[PDB]
Amino acid sequence: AAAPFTYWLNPEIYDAGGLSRRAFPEGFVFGTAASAYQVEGMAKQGGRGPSIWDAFIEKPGTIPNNATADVTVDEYHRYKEDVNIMKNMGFDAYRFSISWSRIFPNGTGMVNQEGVDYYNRLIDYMVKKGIKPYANLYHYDLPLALHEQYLGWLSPNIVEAFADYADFCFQTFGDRVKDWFTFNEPRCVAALGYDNGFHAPGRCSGCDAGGNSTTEPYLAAHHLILSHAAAVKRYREKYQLYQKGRIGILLDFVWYEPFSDSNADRAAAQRARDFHLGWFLDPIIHGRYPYSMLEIVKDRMPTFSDEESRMVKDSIDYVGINHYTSFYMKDPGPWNLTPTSYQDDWHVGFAYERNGVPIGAQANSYWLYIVPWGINKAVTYVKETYGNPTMILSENGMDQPGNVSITQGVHDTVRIRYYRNYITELKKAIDDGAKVIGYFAWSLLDNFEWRLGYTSRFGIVYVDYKTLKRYPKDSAFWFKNMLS
Numbered sequence: 001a002a003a004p005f006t007y008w009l010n011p012e013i014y015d016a017g018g019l020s021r022r023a024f025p026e027g028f029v030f031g032t033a034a035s036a037y038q039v040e041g042m043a044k045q046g047g048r049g050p051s052i053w054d055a056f057i058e059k060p061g062t063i064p065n066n067a068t069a070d071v072t073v074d075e076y077h078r079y080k081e082d083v084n085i086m087k088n089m090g091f092d093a094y095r096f097s098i099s100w101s102r103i104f105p106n107g108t109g110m111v112n113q114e115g116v117d118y119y120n121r122l123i124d125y126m127v128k129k130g131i132k133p134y135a136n137l138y139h140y141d142l143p144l145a146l147h148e149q150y151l152g153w154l155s156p157n158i159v160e161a162f163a164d165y166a167d168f169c170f171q172t173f174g175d176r177v178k179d180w181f182t183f184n185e186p187r188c189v190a191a192l193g194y195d196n197g198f199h200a201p202g203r204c205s206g207c208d209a210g211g212n213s214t215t216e217p218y219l220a221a222h223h224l225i226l227s228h229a230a231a232v233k234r235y236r237e238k239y240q241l242y243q244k245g246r247i248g249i250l251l252d253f254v255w256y257e258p259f260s261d262s263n264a265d266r267a268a269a270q271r272a273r274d275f276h277l278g279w280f281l282d283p284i285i286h287g288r289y290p291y292s293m294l295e296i297v298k299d300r301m302p303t304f305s306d307e308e309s310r311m312v313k314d315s316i317d318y319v320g321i322n323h324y325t326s327f328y329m330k331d332p333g334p335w336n337l338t339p340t341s342y343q344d345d346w347h348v349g350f351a352y353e354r355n356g357v358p359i360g361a362q363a364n365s366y367w368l369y370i371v372p373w374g375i376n377k378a379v380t381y382v383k384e385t386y387g388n389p390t391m392i393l394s395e396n397g398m399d400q401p402g403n404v405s406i407t408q409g410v411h412d413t414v415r416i417r418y419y420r421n422y423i424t425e426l427k428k429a430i431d432d433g434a435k436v437i438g439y440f441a442w443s444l445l446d447n448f449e450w451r452l453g454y455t456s457r458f459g460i461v462y463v464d465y466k467t468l469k470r471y472p473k474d475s476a477f478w479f480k481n482m483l484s
């Protein structure tokens with residue numbers, strides 16, 4: 001049992017700000033989201049082959065305090081408890097991811113039956129408890145074998161490797177999983193993996209592992225798009241009419257607000273949207289890359305053949321938008337001109353304040369600014385720009401510093417205000433015609449936050465890493481109250 005202050009009843013819990021299920025469309029889904037590597041543990045066990053993150057983690061100094069996700073919050077063994085918390089808090093759904101290398105230790109070939117069994121236990125238990133499973137197929141965890149064989153996303157070989165893996169998952173799990181995502185944040189897979197080397201496999205221009213920031217991110221993104229399209233084709237031709245599910249992709253989207261009303265600032269904000277979201281959503285909706293990207297990046301960007309363009313266009317039933325934050329965008333003056341990096345290709349200036357006033361308070365993470373109206377502007381933008389496609393707001397949340405006690409950690413009033421305000425702004429966008437059908441908080445549990453390790457807590461449930469005990473935060477109860 002914890003210190004007395006743990007059990008103070010935060011009155012913010014009961015201020016739902018006017019929100020309930022009645023403020024949302026009939027059958028609107030409220031969920032939480034996690035990922036295999038961040039929550040499962042058993043990284044080197046249960047027959048799981050290693051991923052790129054397992055080798056990347058081995059360089060000392062990469063994770064703070066050289067922490068690993070070998071155990072993390074141990075959802076492999078504690079999945080029943082986690083599902084029960086989800087149910088008790090009133091959630092309808094859980095978006096989780098399947099570990100490619102847990103099913104295919106070598107990426108292709110032999111199946112790890114022990115991994116298959118785990119996901120079957122997990123899915124069977126969610127169905128038993130009335131939590132809808134939303135399965136994401138890839139969450140930063142490429143099997144290491146594939147990276148060793150042909151450098152993973154940088155080779156056209158990855159496309160059939162992935163499609164076959166997707167295919168197997170549909171065959172095996174699709175009798176009860178009716179909601180699929182191919183990828184989480186392919187932009188990040190490409191940009192962090194191959195532009196700045198911040199994420200595995202740590203490739204970039206200056207990087208230890210080698211790389212080329214001018215070409216490799218574009219090559220990676222191209223094969224991610226082809227792999228998504230190839231996977232969806234399997235689903236549609238072989239499973240969809242029989243299983244009656246749906247398939248989409250999850251795309252991160254930072255809102256870019258023009259800094260001023262000038263043509264140049266307004267154009268800069270559009271350019272950033274092109275490179276951030278358009279990069280993936282233009283091909284999926286129009287069968288082609290953003291014009292700006294083609295004119296700036298020229299031949300450093302691959303092109304789709306006519307056959308590819310047809311496979312890629314309309315290759316979703318819905319799009320998941322992951323949204324956290326917003327920045328101001330400036331025209332940065334005259335552009336160079338000589339290729340440097342995907343990020344430099346955007347040719348923009350970032351701004352985090354205007355007239356001495358910050359755009360929002362900062363969460364723990366260096367990148368996260370709390371800007372509730374950004375979620376409204378983002379959703380309206382995809383509605384207007386893309387013919388109002390069916391959307392899931394597939395991630396939203398914020399982090400506390402990792403190094404806080406149970407007692408301090410559970411009283412997360414800042415997160416309550418975060419969710420109340422963001423969900424209010426999302427509601428306004430729906431009232432004005434946006435076709436959103438679900439919302440997912442990141443995340444249920446404090447977990448392994450990639451390069452930040454355990455110095456960042458995103459959960460609505462506090463996890464003591466010493467004991468692995470769960471303590472619902474005030475924000476979990478805020479949801480419980482709002483959802484009934």
Ligand SMILES: OC[C@H]1O[C@@H](O)[C@@H](O)[C@@H](O)[C@@H]1O
Binds near residue numbers: 442
């Ligand atoms: O930063 C919080 C979260 O944001 C998205 O990238 C998620 O898909 C996770 O990978 C991550 O933990």
